[PDB]
Symmetry: C3
Subunit: 544 residues, 3 copies
């Protein structure tokens, strides 16, 4: 029987049969079943001998600190891991029972409680976010560092599926071609919830976050350090959801970490959602010398050829900035940002294109100077502004924009050039008003007053079948001060404005034209005429 059995059954070793995780690992050949809770000590390391194993977790790993898995064979997969700290830390909860953000340090301090979820351990960035809190927090709530972390170290082709936990963290250190798939809403701890760190060895590649969901955590939910997806864009975040990040939903690190660059290139950031982060929805910047990276003499600050593939992202309820990034020659598309407390988008980009961007009701707490800020010479094609709420809305000094929609206040727009070059035949439709209008505003003259208009006003009331058209010009900072009318009171004639006094030679502009003016002392209308030959002559036009 032994021979028959050895050839017909699936091999799998189970934790309940061994005293330590390493004993189970050494015995493993194909599958490995975690069938009983295991208390690990921080730094406990397991060597898997290069075996390609399938780890099925049906119990939890308990402990503060890291449980390090090493030498897992390419193709290995861990499913259902549950990480839980042994410590129940002090957590703050900066939001109310109506889901309103609390921004007052005292009100935030009052939310203190010992829990492994539904809040997060204060971190030094909170001292900045809620000014004064550093002084108000009791010593036992400061400097906490609890996280139950599964650290996958220097492995390749290892995937972690349906992970979860309380005060949980997942760290891939020096890994390549690894994936965090369908994270089953782990509640984060002090550290990042999903981190791909490649500060040593080669630049990380093939590392992805696919289809997850995370909640809380003191810092960013998903973060990358020194990763480069290459031209193939092999790496990034796709179909992921982040709830209530203590810092940001997804973040690519900036600047120098240790003695090398922590920046990232050629990653995908698509079809993902970030809701209610204490800081940003997406923090895709690289710059904040650059050892280990491009020199400033080659690429100035904020002008790195990051080349990320960014598309179809949704952000809602950030206390900070909805979407932020930097870079040169970037193409960004289909971004939707709604109901944020800080800027909806903060863009330190140059020579980049933004297509179909919707920034709806953001900067609601006036944390910044505008709803959307663009640094360099960029192009925006399709920009939706204003939802249900009423600083500048958009300040993009060197950018050319087209296709803005929404109830934006014109005085709150600052761009280099705004234009609709390719519209077809047009119709202005007016509702709930006695007139329709097409207004012109030269922002160089005034950002608050229209300089001229073409109106249509009703004569009589509804259903009269009559209206008058008037062409206006501003004078003395009084809009519509001067104007020519056609059909006022259904008279069917043109009412024409004349100079109220003797017209000066320079008033008339073109040849073959005449400018009527008033001669009060003779009660006559005169006409300054500039003949077709350019010569001026004054004629009598109308008299008693």
């Amino acid at each position: 029987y032994s021979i028959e059995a050895d050839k017909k059954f699936k091999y799998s070793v189970k934790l309940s049969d061994y005293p330590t995780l390493q004993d189970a690992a050494s015995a493993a050949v194909d599958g490995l079943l975690i069938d009983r809770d295991y208390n690990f000590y921080g730094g406990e390391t397991v060597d898997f001998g290069g075996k390609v194993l399938t780890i099925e977790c049906k119990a939890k790993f308990i402990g503060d600190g890291n449980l390090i898995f090493t030498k897992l064979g390419k193709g290995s997969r861990i499913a259902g891991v549950f990480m839980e700290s042994t410590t129940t830390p002090w957590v703050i909860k900066p939001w109310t029972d109506d889901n309103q953000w609390l921004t007052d340090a005292a009100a935030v301090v009052a939310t203190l409680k010992q829990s492994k979820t539904d809040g997060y351990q204060p971190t030094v960035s909170d001292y900045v976010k809620f000014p004064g809190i550093e002084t108000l927090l009791p010593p036992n709530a400061k400097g906490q560092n609890i996280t139950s972390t599964l650290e996958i170290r220097e492995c390749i082709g290892v995937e972690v599926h349906r992970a979860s936990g309380l005060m949980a963290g997942f760290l891939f250190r020096g890994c390549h071609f690894c994936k965090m798939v369908d994270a089953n809403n782990p509640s984060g701890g002090k550290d990042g919830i999903i981190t791909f760190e490649n500060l040593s060895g080669d630049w990380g590649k093939g590392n992805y976050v696919i289809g997850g969901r995370t909640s809380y955590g003191s810092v960013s939910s998903a973060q990358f350090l020194r990763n480069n997806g290459g031209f193939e864009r092999d790496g990034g975040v796709i179909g992921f959801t982040s709830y209530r990040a203590g810092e940001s939903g997804v973040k690519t690190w900036q600047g120098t970490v240790g003695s090398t660059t922590s920046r990232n290139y050629n990653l995908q950031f698509r079809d993902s959602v970030v809701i209610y982060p204490v800081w940003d929805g997406f923090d895709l910047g690289a710059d904040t010398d650059r050892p280990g990276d491009y020199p400033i003499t080659q690429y100035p600050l904020h002008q790195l050829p990051l080349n990320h593939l960014i598309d179809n992202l949704l952000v809602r309820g950030a206390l900070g900035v909805g979407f932020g990034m930097d870079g040169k020659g970037m193409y960004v598309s289909n971004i939707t940002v709604e109901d944020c407390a800080g800027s909806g988008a903060y863009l330190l980009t140059h020579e980049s294109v933004f297509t179909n961007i919707a920034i709806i009701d953001t900067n609601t707490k006036d944390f910044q100077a505008n709803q959307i800020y663009i640094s360099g010479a960029c192009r925006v094609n399709g920009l939706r502004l204003i939802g249900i709420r009423s600083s500048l809305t958009i300040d993009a000094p060197n950018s050319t924009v087209s296709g803005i929609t929404g109830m934006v206040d014109p005085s709150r727009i600052n761009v280099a050039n705004l234009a609709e070059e390719g519209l077809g035949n047009i119709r202005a439709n007016s509702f709930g008003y006695d007139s329709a209008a097409i207004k012109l505003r030269i922002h160089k003259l005034s950002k608050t007053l229209d300089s001229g208009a073409l109106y249509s006003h009703i004569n009589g009331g509804a259903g009269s079948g009559s209206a008058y058209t008037q062409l206006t010009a501003i004078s003395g900072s009084t809009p519509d001060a001067v104007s020519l009318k056609v059909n006022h009171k259904d008279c069917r004639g043109a009412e024409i404005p004349f100079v109220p006094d003797i017209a000066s030679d320079d008033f008339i502009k073109d040849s073959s034209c005449f400018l009527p003016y008033w001669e009060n002392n003779s009660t006559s209308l005169k006409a300054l005429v500039k003949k077709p030959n350019g010569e001026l002559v004054r004629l009598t036009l109308a008299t008693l």
Copy 2:
């Protein structure tokens, strides 16, 4: 050997070894293999003893009625389940060989056949959908109730993967943190195909439909009763496809069911597709007192703070309404609805924002009064109307709209306010016409006639390098009746309209202006002048 074997092999029990499902369940420790068809009786209940098991289905469960699974341990997963009724009911197929919907009761009755798919059992709602059918249907096709249902009862953290079946249904009763993942196109029965019901106990939370595909069924494909995803929005429908729902693709129930509320809050409805439902694509309403829910004195009908996260949905071919919902303070984005028989969108919302909505060729069978209806004071930013087809198009009386695109008939638009406040320098480009135009229409005066215009017309023909500009005003319900022209017939002068008779004092409007008028009895042009001091005087302007 026994000891060695007990420690190195994967545990799994298989149905073929036991007489009943319960005997297999009691014997199970890790895996459970369904390797032979099992005929269950309705109400047959299996107790899994709290074990965390992995059920792999490679055969089917056959029977009419429910197969109830209980006490499954957190972490349990069932994959590949196939449900099939024992009965082959009578089904109707309200569509033709060209995929055209049949709406005539007689034509629908004629499609009757006994089958477990490619149709659905008539339900009382069909009596409403195809009027007269109640009288035409034979008694053996009425009141049928066939469904082979897998009922997961009061379990937590249980996932059902790649389910399928004929006349199949999946019901999670009183469950939490459960998921229906990658449904492998089950063909539905009389009941909902995927139902998360939480009428008892706590409000459902953590329940999701992720990546599915379903077909047919007599009622809704995916439906939720008394679920609340909380602020974290833990629950809902993501990446799902519903084909030919007998009622709607996805539905959140409304009103009182039993003696409690069946409503839902804080759920996600994103990246999903609904095609050809007999009723609606998405029915996300809550209201239709409210025991067990908010009182009407707190939130009036249709004004519940539902707070769903709705984004990126596509609907095509609904016989009913494409997208429908109610609520207050909702944010909805990126909805695309095409080729529907009833309204494309029916919105009973108040104080809500709709961003980037496309309603293309809907209400094609004039089932409703408009393509899109909005009840309350809402904001629409970006609205695309009209595809290839020619009631009102949009009736949103109290809403402010901006950014409409498409070949819409202006007379068919009714909104509170329509405006493009932030356009740049504009160019109207005319194709296939001898003129370009910018028309103004005051809907208060007339919804059918333009009240004025600014035209440019060719003088001569193509390539003449000449055109004339004319400014018009409507009079006597005849549009363009009065007008001033510049360069008519390349004359290079302004043609000006004068009052055809003695002008009345009230015809002139502003000071420092003059209004030419005709004096027929002297063959002279006179000028009613309103001096810069406000006084009127009549002067002679032109004579023989």
Copy 3:
């Protein structure tokens, strides 16, 4: 013990125990573990006896040619397969270290190297793509045919998960209800990477590519031949990414293959991304008689009722065309195409609707005559053109378009009709200029010059509170040649242009109007008057 063991353990056979794959297959009952590399010979066929098995691959299948799997039971799944050729062919790499495309035959020939990835084997289509290359390529780099192919033959309900490989190919021949799920970036060979071929038997149905990622390959990444998803749209490509296809990202075949049609109907093409294909992003055409398909007498060329469900696709960096297709009565939505060398979209469609299309910086190498081409009578609602780059932009002769946004050159637009029928009250906002403008252009008169305008110009400088409005008309091909001004130099009067000479009777248009003209020999302004009765009379208007 034997009895106890036979009833409590999971059955699985492993390759290392058998000499050939067939011996392992015959022994299999539930699971099958590929635990050692297996060298197969081309054409090696394995018969699985109709068993429903779970094949877990933890090693690779090595060989040039096909490894044919047959008679796999419905429900079978293969996971982690790795295909690798035994041959290391000669591959070209048509792109540089900066990711710039190389288009010069000599430069491309110079990239030759022996590798199993990071390039692809030249194919006859390369002779067309890089003209002259056929002559420059050495004989050992021509006509290569290396591919390690897993061929699933005439099976139903079989899914392949997380496949990978080098010079790898996956072929479903005569299959139905099969799926290629989460392809783990296989590097392609000479043949298609994922192919659903149904040239024999029934039309393919239920075949999908779900969530993949592929790289390289000599031809198309994902392709379908003679598949029909039916009205249910059961089949297609969802959530897939294709990098550097030697031909196209996803392709539906056209014309006759063998003696039958290779065309496809009713498939889904959604939420997918294609980057850097040597040819097209998406090639969704059917036409290029039609044996086995609809006759030309029924549906003319390019007018097949294809009916695909197309939505949310992104294309970037194609050397060929971003998005291409043909058909009649199609509905296409939310397509984003950026930075392509050839056309962004080539559409040979008739009676079809395109909603929310963004074509940004395409045809950058002038490979075609335009950025977007539409053949038939179609409708476009929402079209974004121009990113950061400066042929026609859009040539759609018989199409009606609305909602264009972007810095498009008007002279480069050709459509049947362009219109904005439903805009609200309008405001033109001008930045960085001394004037604001609303220009009118009759393309019938001239595609390069505006025929008239309504301007607002500053009088003085910034903050003067004064501006003048002028209405212009083109004359002698000189735009703005004739014009009426209101408030020039803050004079507060209307400057009016008169005919520079005796006005001819035909110059005046309407009754009750007058047209001033010059009478040089008397230094007087006269007025050609057309009385309200239609009679003409010349009056003296202004004299010395």
